[PDB]
Design a protein around this nucleic acid. Structure first.
Length: 65
DNA sequence: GTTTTCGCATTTATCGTGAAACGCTTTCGCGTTTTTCGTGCGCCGCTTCATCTGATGTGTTGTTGACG
C-alpha cells in the first residue's frame, strides 16, 4: 500500500470527528479533495479494512462522552 | 545399471484491489384517518312591567345699599 499520506490522514481526521460522517460520503468527499490535490487513493474496501486494523478503541475515541 | 537429487513446467490457489451486491435501519411520501376547533342555532329560565326621579355644605362673586 503506497498512497498519499495526506489523503489517508485527511480521511482519518474526518472519521475521528464527533460528527463521524458516513464512510461512503466522507470517502466521496475525500475523492473530491484527492481530485483537487491529485492524490492517489486506495480501494474503499482496503481503507475500511485498515480502519478495522486501527482499533475498536478508535470508535469510542471518536464519539467518546 | 539403479537410485536420488536438481532444474524446469503447468496448474491451482489466493490475495489485494476496486466496483458492486445485499440487508438493515431510517425517513418521507402520499392516500386515507382522527381529533379539535369554530360557527351556529334553538331553548330555557329569570326577571320586570301592569306608574317612576334628584340633593347638600362652603366659598366666591356680584349687586345693591349705606355711608362719607
Amino acid at each position: 500500500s503506497e498512497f498519499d499520506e495526506d489523503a489517508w490522514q485527511f480521511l482519518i481526521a474526518d472519521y475521528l470527528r464527533p460528527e463521524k460522517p458516513a464512510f461512503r460520503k466522507c470517502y466521496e468527499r475525500l475523492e473530491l479533495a484527492a481530485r483537487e490535490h491529485g492524490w492517489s487513493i486506495p480501494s474503499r474496501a482496503t481503507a475500511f479494512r485498515r480502519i478495522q486494523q486501527l482499533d475498536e478503541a478508535m470508535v469510542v475515541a471518536c464519539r467518546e462522552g
